[PDB]
Coordinates of C-alpha atoms in Angstrom, one line a residue:
Chain A
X1 CA -1.2 -24.5 5.8
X2 CA -4.4 -26.2 4.4
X3 CA -7.2 -26.9 6.9
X4 CA -8.7 -29.9 5.0
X5 CA -7.4 -33.5 5.0
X6 CA -8.1 -36.1 2.3
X7 CA -8.2 -39.6 3.8
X8 CA -5.8 -41.7 1.6
Chain B
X1 CA -13.3 -56.3 -6.3
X2 CA -14.1 -52.6 -5.8
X3 CA -10.8 -51.3 -7.4
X4 CA -11.0 -48.9 -10.3
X5 CA -14.7 -48.9 -11.0
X6 CA -16.0 -46.4 -13.5
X7 CA -18.3 -43.7 -12.3
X8 CA -21.1 -45.2 -14.5
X9 CA -20.8 -48.6 -12.7
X10 CA -20.9 -46.8 -9.3
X11 CA -24.0 -45.0 -10.4
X12 CA -25.6 -48.2 -11.7
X13 CA -24.9 -50.0 -8.4
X14 CA -26.0 -47.1 -6.1
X15 CA -29.3 -46.7 -8.2
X16 CA -30.0 -50.4 -7.8
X17 CA -32.7 -51.6 -5.3
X18 CA -30.2 -53.9 -3.5
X19 CA -28.6 -52.5 -0.3
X20 CA -25.6 -54.8 -0.7
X21 CA -25.0 -53.7 -4.3
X22 CA -25.3 -50.1 -3.1
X23 CA -22.6 -50.9 -0.4
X24 CA -20.3 -52.3 -3.0
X25 CA -20.7 -49.4 -5.4
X26 CA -20.2 -47.0 -2.4
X27 CA -17.0 -48.7 -1.4
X28 CA -15.8 -48.5 -5.0
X29 CA -16.5 -44.7 -4.9
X30 CA -14.6 -44.5 -1.6
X31 CA -11.6 -46.2 -3.2
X32 CA -11.7 -43.8 -6.2
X33 CA -11.7 -40.8 -3.9
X34 CA -8.9 -42.1 -1.7
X35 CA -6.3 -42.7 -4.5
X36 CA -3.0 -40.8 -4.5
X37 CA -3.3 -39.0 -7.8
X38 CA -6.3 -36.8 -8.8
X39 CA -9.5 -38.3 -7.3
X40 CA -12.5 -37.8 -9.6
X41 CA -14.3 -35.5 -7.1
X42 CA -16.0 -33.4 -9.7
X43 CA -17.1 -36.5 -11.7
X44 CA -18.6 -38.0 -8.5
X45 CA -20.5 -34.8 -7.7
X46 CA -21.7 -34.4 -11.3
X47 CA -23.1 -38.0 -11.2
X48 CA -25.5 -36.8 -8.4
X49 CA -24.1 -39.2 -5.8
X50 CA -23.9 -36.9 -2.8
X51 CA -27.6 -37.2 -1.7
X52 CA -27.3 -41.0 -1.9
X53 CA -24.3 -41.0 0.3
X54 CA -25.9 -38.7 2.8
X55 CA -28.9 -41.1 2.9
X56 CA -26.5 -44.0 3.5
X57 CA -25.1 -42.2 6.5
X58 CA -28.4 -42.8 8.3
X59 CA -28.7 -46.6 7.6
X60 CA -28.1 -47.8 11.2
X61 CA -28.8 -51.4 10.3
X62 CA -25.8 -51.4 7.8
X63 CA -22.9 -49.8 9.5
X64 CA -20.5 -50.7 6.6
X65 CA -22.3 -48.4 4.1
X66 CA -22.4 -45.7 6.8
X67 CA -18.6 -46.0 7.0
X68 CA -18.0 -46.0 3.2
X69 CA -20.4 -43.1 2.6
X70 CA -18.8 -41.2 5.5
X71 CA -15.4 -41.7 4.0
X72 CA -16.4 -40.8 0.5
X73 CA -18.2 -37.6 1.7
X74 CA -15.1 -36.9 3.8
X75 CA -12.8 -36.9 0.8
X76 CA -15.2 -34.9 -1.3
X77 CA -15.4 -32.3 1.5
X78 CA -11.6 -32.2 1.6
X79 CA -11.5 -30.4 -1.8
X80 CA -12.3 -26.9 -3.0
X81 CA -14.8 -24.7 -1.3
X82 CA -17.3 -25.6 -4.1
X83 CA -17.0 -29.3 -3.4
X84 CA -17.3 -28.9 0.3
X85 CA -20.3 -26.7 -0.4
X86 CA -21.7 -29.7 -2.5
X87 CA -21.3 -31.9 0.6
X88 CA -23.1 -29.3 2.8
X89 CA -25.9 -28.7 0.4
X90 CA -26.7 -32.5 0.6
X91 CA -27.6 -32.2 4.2
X92 CA -24.5 -33.9 5.5
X93 CA -23.8 -31.8 8.6
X94 CA -26.7 -33.1 10.8
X95 CA -26.1 -36.6 9.5
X96 CA -22.4 -36.6 10.5
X97 CA -23.3 -35.0 13.9
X98 CA -25.8 -37.9 14.3
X99 CA -23.0 -40.4 13.5
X100 CA -20.7 -38.8 16.2
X101 CA -22.7 -41.0 18.7
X102 CA -22.1 -44.2 16.7
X103 CA -21.2 -47.3 18.8
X104 CA -18.6 -48.0 16.1
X105 CA -15.4 -46.1 16.7
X106 CA -14.3 -45.9 13.1
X107 CA -17.6 -44.5 11.9
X108 CA -17.7 -41.9 14.7
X109 CA -14.0 -41.0 13.8
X110 CA -15.0 -40.7 10.1
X111 CA -17.8 -38.3 11.1
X112 CA -15.3 -36.3 13.2
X113 CA -13.0 -36.1 10.1
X114 CA -15.8 -35.0 7.8
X115 CA -17.0 -32.3 10.2
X116 CA -13.3 -31.3 10.4
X117 CA -13.1 -30.6 6.7
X118 CA -16.5 -28.9 6.5
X119 CA -15.8 -26.6 9.4
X120 CA -12.2 -26.1 8.1
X121 CA -13.6 -24.6 4.9
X122 CA -14.1 -21.2 6.5
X123 CA -15.9 -19.1 9.0
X124 CA -19.4 -19.6 7.5
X125 CA -19.4 -23.4 7.4
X126 CA -17.6 -23.4 10.8
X127 CA -20.4 -21.4 12.4
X128 CA -23.0 -23.6 10.6
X129 CA -21.4 -26.8 12.0
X130 CA -21.5 -25.1 15.4
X131 CA -25.2 -24.1 14.9
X132 CA -26.1 -27.7 14.2
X133 CA -24.7 -28.6 17.6
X134 CA -21.5 -30.5 16.9
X135 CA -19.5 -29.2 19.9
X136 CA -21.5 -31.1 22.6
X137 CA -21.1 -34.6 21.1
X138 CA -17.5 -33.8 19.9
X139 CA -16.5 -32.9 23.4
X140 CA -18.4 -35.8 24.8
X141 CA -16.2 -38.1 22.8
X142 CA -13.2 -36.7 24.9
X143 CA -15.0 -36.9 28.3
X144 CA -12.8 -39.7 29.8
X145 CA -10.7 -39.8 32.9
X146 CA -7.4 -40.3 31.0
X147 CA -7.0 -39.4 27.3
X148 CA -4.3 -42.1 27.0
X149 CA -7.1 -44.8 26.8
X150 CA -8.3 -43.4 23.5
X151 CA -6.7 -44.5 20.2
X152 CA -3.9 -42.3 19.0
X153 CA -5.5 -41.6 15.6
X154 CA -8.9 -41.0 17.1
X155 CA -7.6 -38.4 19.6
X156 CA -5.5 -36.8 16.8
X157 CA -8.5 -36.4 14.5
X158 CA -10.7 -35.0 17.4
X159 CA -8.0 -32.5 18.3
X160 CA -7.6 -31.5 14.6
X161 CA -11.3 -30.9 14.1
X162 CA -11.6 -28.9 17.3
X163 CA -8.7 -26.8 16.1
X164 CA -10.6 -26.1 12.9
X165 CA -13.6 -25.0 15.0
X166 CA -11.2 -22.5 16.6
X167 CA -9.7 -21.4 13.2
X168 CA -10.5 -18.5 10.8
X169 CA -11.6 -14.9 11.5
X170 CA -14.0 -12.3 10.0
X171 CA -15.8 -13.4 12.1
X172 CA -13.9 -15.3 14.8
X173 CA -15.7 -18.2 16.3
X174 CA -18.6 -17.4 18.6
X175 CA -17.5 -16.5 22.2
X176 CA -19.8 -19.1 23.7
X177 CA -18.4 -21.8 21.5
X178 CA -14.8 -20.8 22.4
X179 CA -15.6 -20.9 26.1
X180 CA -17.3 -24.3 25.6
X181 CA -14.2 -25.7 23.8
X182 CA -11.4 -24.1 25.9
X183 CA -11.3 -26.5 28.9
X184 CA -10.9 -29.6 26.7
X185 CA -8.3 -27.7 24.7
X186 CA -6.4 -27.1 28.0
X187 CA -6.6 -30.8 28.7
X188 CA -5.3 -31.7 25.3
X189 CA -2.5 -29.1 25.7
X190 CA -1.1 -31.4 28.4
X191 CA -1.3 -34.7 26.4
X192 CA 2.0 -36.5 25.6
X193 CA 1.3 -37.0 21.8
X194 CA 3.3 -34.6 19.6
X195 CA 0.5 -34.2 17.1
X196 CA -2.1 -33.5 19.7
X197 CA 0.2 -30.9 21.2
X198 CA 0.9 -29.3 17.8
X199 CA -2.8 -29.1 16.9
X200 CA -3.7 -27.8 20.4
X201 CA -1.0 -25.1 20.2
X202 CA -2.4 -24.2 16.7
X203 CA -5.9 -23.9 18.1
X204 CA -4.7 -21.7 21.0
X205 CA -2.8 -19.6 18.4
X206 CA -6.1 -19.1 16.5
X207 CA -7.9 -18.1 19.6
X208 CA -5.2 -15.6 20.5
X209 CA -5.2 -14.0 17.0
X210 CA -7.6 -11.2 17.8
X211 CA -8.6 -8.4 20.2
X212 CA -7.4 -8.3 23.8
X213 CA -10.7 -9.8 25.0
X214 CA -10.0 -13.1 23.1
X215 CA -6.4 -13.2 24.3
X216 CA -7.9 -12.7 27.8
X217 CA -10.2 -15.7 27.3
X218 CA -7.2 -17.8 26.6
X219 CA -4.8 -16.4 29.2
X220 CA -7.4 -16.6 32.0
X221 CA -7.3 -20.4 31.6
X222 CA -3.7 -20.3 32.8
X223 CA -2.1 -21.9 29.7
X224 CA 0.8 -19.5 29.3
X225 CA 3.3 -21.6 31.4
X226 CA 2.4 -24.7 29.3
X227 CA 2.9 -22.6 26.2
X228 CA 6.4 -21.6 27.3
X229 CA 7.2 -25.2 28.2
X230 CA 6.1 -26.3 24.7
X231 CA 8.0 -23.3 23.3
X232 CA 11.1 -25.1 24.6
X233 CA 10.2 -28.4 22.9
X234 CA 12.5 -30.2 20.4
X235 CA 9.8 -30.8 17.8
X236 CA 9.6 -27.9 15.4
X237 CA 5.9 -28.7 14.7
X238 CA 5.3 -27.9 18.4
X239 CA 7.6 -24.9 18.7
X240 CA 6.1 -23.1 15.7
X241 CA 2.5 -23.0 16.9
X242 CA 3.6 -22.3 20.5
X243 CA 5.7 -19.4 19.4
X244 CA 2.9 -18.0 17.3
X245 CA 0.6 -18.2 20.3
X246 CA 3.1 -16.4 22.6
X247 CA 3.6 -13.7 20.0
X248 CA -0.2 -13.2 19.6
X249 CA -0.5 -13.0 23.4
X250 CA 2.2 -10.3 23.7
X251 CA 0.4 -8.3 21.0
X252 CA -2.1 -7.6 23.8
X253 CA -2.0 -5.5 26.9
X254 CA 1.1 -5.0 29.0
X255 CA -0.4 -7.3 31.7
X256 CA -0.8 -10.2 29.4
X257 CA 2.7 -9.7 28.0
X258 CA 3.8 -9.6 31.6
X259 CA 2.1 -13.0 32.2
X260 CA 4.2 -14.3 29.3
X261 CA 7.4 -12.9 30.9
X262 CA 6.6 -14.3 34.4
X263 CA 6.3 -17.8 32.8
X264 CA 10.0 -17.6 31.8
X265 CA 9.5 -17.1 28.1
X266 CA 12.5 -14.8 27.6
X267 CA 14.9 -17.5 28.8
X268 CA 14.0 -19.4 25.6
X269 CA 14.8 -16.6 23.2
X270 CA 18.6 -17.0 23.0
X271 CA 17.9 -20.2 21.1
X272 CA 14.9 -19.0 19.2
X273 CA 16.7 -15.8 18.0
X274 CA 19.5 -18.1 16.6
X275 CA 17.2 -20.9 15.5
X276 CA 18.3 -22.4 12.2
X277 CA 14.7 -22.3 10.8
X278 CA 14.1 -18.9 9.3
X279 CA 10.5 -18.7 10.3
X280 CA 11.3 -19.4 14.0
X281 CA 13.8 -16.6 14.0
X282 CA 11.4 -14.2 12.3
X283 CA 8.5 -15.0 14.6
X284 CA 10.8 -14.8 17.7
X285 CA 12.1 -11.4 16.6
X286 CA 8.5 -10.2 16.0
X287 CA 7.5 -11.4 19.5
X288 CA 10.5 -9.5 20.9
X289 CA 9.5 -6.4 19.0
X290 CA 6.1 -6.7 20.7
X291 CA 7.8 -7.0 24.1
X292 CA 10.2 -4.1 23.7
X293 CA 7.1 -2.0 22.8
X294 CA 5.9 -2.5 26.4
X295 CA 6.7 -1.0 29.8
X296 CA 10.2 0.0 30.9
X297 CA 10.4 -2.7 33.5
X298 CA 9.6 -5.2 30.7
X299 CA 12.3 -3.7 28.4
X300 CA 14.5 -4.1 31.5
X301 CA 13.5 -7.8 31.6
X302 CA 14.7 -8.1 28.0
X303 CA 18.0 -6.5 29.0
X304 CA 18.5 -8.7 32.0
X305 CA 18.1 -11.9 30.0
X306 CA 20.9 -10.7 27.7
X307 CA 18.6 -10.5 24.6
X308 CA 19.9 -7.2 23.3
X309 CA 23.1 -8.8 22.0
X310 CA 20.9 -11.3 20.2
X311 CA 18.9 -8.5 18.6
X312 CA 22.2 -6.9 17.5
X313 CA 23.1 -10.3 16.0
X314 CA 19.8 -10.7 14.1
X315 CA 20.1 -7.1 12.9
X316 CA 23.7 -7.9 11.7
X317 CA 23.0 -11.1 9.9
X318 CA 19.6 -12.8 9.2
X319 CA 16.9 -13.2 6.5
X320 CA 15.8 -9.7 5.5
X321 CA 12.3 -10.0 7.0
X322 CA 13.8 -11.1 10.3
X323 CA 16.1 -8.1 10.1
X324 CA 13.0 -5.9 9.5
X325 CA 11.3 -7.3 12.7
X326 CA 14.6 -6.6 14.4
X327 CA 14.5 -3.0 13.3
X328 CA 11.0 -2.7 14.6
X329 CA 12.1 -4.2 18.0
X330 CA 14.9 -1.6 18.1
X331 CA 12.6 1.3 17.3
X332 CA 10.1 0.3 20.0
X333 CA 12.9 -0.2 22.5
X334 CA 14.3 3.3 21.8
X335 CA 10.8 4.8 21.9
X336 CA 9.8 3.4 25.3
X337 CA 13.2 2.9 26.8
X338 CA 15.0 4.9 29.4
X339 CA 18.2 6.9 28.7
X340 CA 20.2 4.2 30.5
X341 CA 18.6 1.4 28.4
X342 CA 19.2 3.3 25.1
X343 CA 22.9 3.9 26.1
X344 CA 23.1 0.2 26.8
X345 CA 21.6 -0.5 23.4
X346 CA 24.4 1.5 21.8
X347 CA 27.1 -0.1 24.0
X348 CA 26.0 -3.5 22.5
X349 CA 26.8 -2.3 19.0
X350 CA 23.5 -1.5 17.4
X351 CA 24.7 1.5 15.5
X352 CA 26.8 -0.2 12.8
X353 CA 24.3 -2.8 11.7
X354 CA 21.5 -0.3 12.0
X355 CA 23.4 1.9 9.5
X356 CA 24.2 -1.0 7.2
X357 CA 20.4 -1.6 7.0
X358 CA 19.9 1.8 5.5
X359 CA 21.2 0.6 2.1
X360 CA 18.1 -1.6 1.9
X361 CA 15.5 -0.9 -0.8
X362 CA 12.5 -1.3 1.6
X363 CA 11.3 2.2 2.4
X364 CA 9.5 1.3 5.7
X365 CA 12.6 -0.3 7.3
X366 CA 14.5 2.9 6.4
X367 CA 11.7 4.9 8.2
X368 CA 11.8 2.6 11.2
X369 CA 15.6 2.9 11.3
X370 CA 15.6 6.7 11.1
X371 CA 13.1 6.9 13.9
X372 CA 15.4 4.7 16.0
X373 CA 18.3 7.0 15.2
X374 CA 16.2 10.0 16.2
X375 CA 15.3 8.5 19.6
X376 CA 18.9 7.6 20.3
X377 CA 20.0 11.1 19.4
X378 CA 17.3 12.4 21.8
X379 CA 18.9 10.3 24.6
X380 CA 22.3 11.7 23.7
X381 CA 20.9 15.2 23.9
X382 CA 19.6 14.4 27.4
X383 CA 23.2 13.3 28.1
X384 CA 25.0 16.0 26.1
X385 CA 26.8 13.2 24.2
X386 CA 25.4 13.9 20.7
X387 CA 28.8 14.7 19.2
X388 CA 30.2 11.2 20.1
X389 CA 27.1 9.6 18.5
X390 CA 27.5 11.7 15.4
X391 CA 31.1 10.5 15.2
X392 CA 30.0 6.9 15.7
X393 CA 27.6 7.2 12.8
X394 CA 30.2 8.9 10.7
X395 CA 33.0 6.3 11.2
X396 CA 30.8 3.4 10.0
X397 CA 29.6 5.1 6.9
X398 CA 26.1 5.9 8.3
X399 CA 26.4 9.7 7.7
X400 CA 26.9 9.0 3.9
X401 CA 23.8 6.9 3.9
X402 CA 21.7 9.5 5.7
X403 CA 22.9 12.4 3.5
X404 CA 22.1 10.2 0.5
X405 CA 18.6 9.6 2.0
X406 CA 18.1 13.3 1.8
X407 CA 17.7 12.6 -2.0
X408 CA 15.3 9.7 -1.3
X409 CA 12.0 10.1 -3.2
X410 CA 9.8 9.2 -0.2
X411 CA 8.6 12.3 1.7
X412 CA 9.0 11.2 5.4
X413 CA 12.4 9.6 4.6
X414 CA 14.1 12.7 3.2
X415 CA 12.4 14.8 5.8
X416 CA 13.8 12.7 8.7
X417 CA 17.2 12.5 7.1
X418 CA 17.3 16.2 6.4
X419 CA 16.4 16.9 10.1
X420 CA 19.0 14.5 11.3
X421 CA 21.7 16.1 9.2
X422 CA 20.9 19.7 10.0
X423 CA 20.4 18.9 13.7
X424 CA 23.3 16.6 14.5
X425 CA 25.8 16.8 11.5
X426 CA 26.7 20.5 11.0

């Protein structure tokens, strides 16, 4: 699973 | 107010000599980058705004623009490796590390998040974040008597970023950094929040995915019992990383595996090996295959817990990959097991499903199966019971499949099958 998170 | 600006308006506001206007344009950028559908990351980068944001990170007298720039850069760094590289090239790492000590909780949290994305890009940026000295302040943020006094989201972001500092290989994280992070990781592994526990188990699973020395670094901290406990959790997001960690650990030496067994892990596998989630079943069968490849007393621990019937079940009916892991577990069992344990394996009904799996198109599972058959036949020879076994294989259609495998194009396949025929079916 992706390791980066976009703050929405 | 700051909703749906154009990139040109943002550039015009940021290039003004008015700190407040710069703040408004920066907030507009943040809102562009935090929308649901397709944020204009590439357009923001092409406008040359990253250095301006980085410079805003250091404006102590205007914490709002620090927060907005931190958020914008966070969302840029959340994209492709090229966009994260754009954030790093702007000098953002030391700036965010400096913000980790901000008296404002939301700014410090935003820095934690940004560093989480940067480090999460890969081994290189991970090690570069570490070289700039992020671990000390990051861990300082968690140096409190009771983690429950921290905000839930704050603690969750810290745990996640730390897990990214433990992630990726080639190379793995620096040993000194892992030793520096492991105690806090153990502390988080006992927290009551499901997301903190999931991310902590993920971090442990990263640290256990490697040579036996890393596995030893983890196991020496005494986390195996806690990992078994969480292995019994009801939340799949916890069971998955915990199971991955356990499997990784049992890929190590027989002593580490034995520490997994002493913690009671096997008692959980009746459920895991019948878990309705395919990946849980597959990973549990893979773990089992790494246990049955160990000592004979450990194989005997598998037997005592009644897990052989569950292996027969998975071999009989499961997703094909899970069945392949089951075949591996069986071949390791028969390779390291005693005559009594192999006899018991046959008494549980392994032969029929083992034969049925010979009609599969995967060559390697056929090889694995034929090795298992060879071993069982060796045990029969040691008992003089080879004829009865040949009859067993013949009554369930296995002999037909082996004889047909004599015509298989793979070398080792038709070799092994020919040997089996001429040695036990004449």
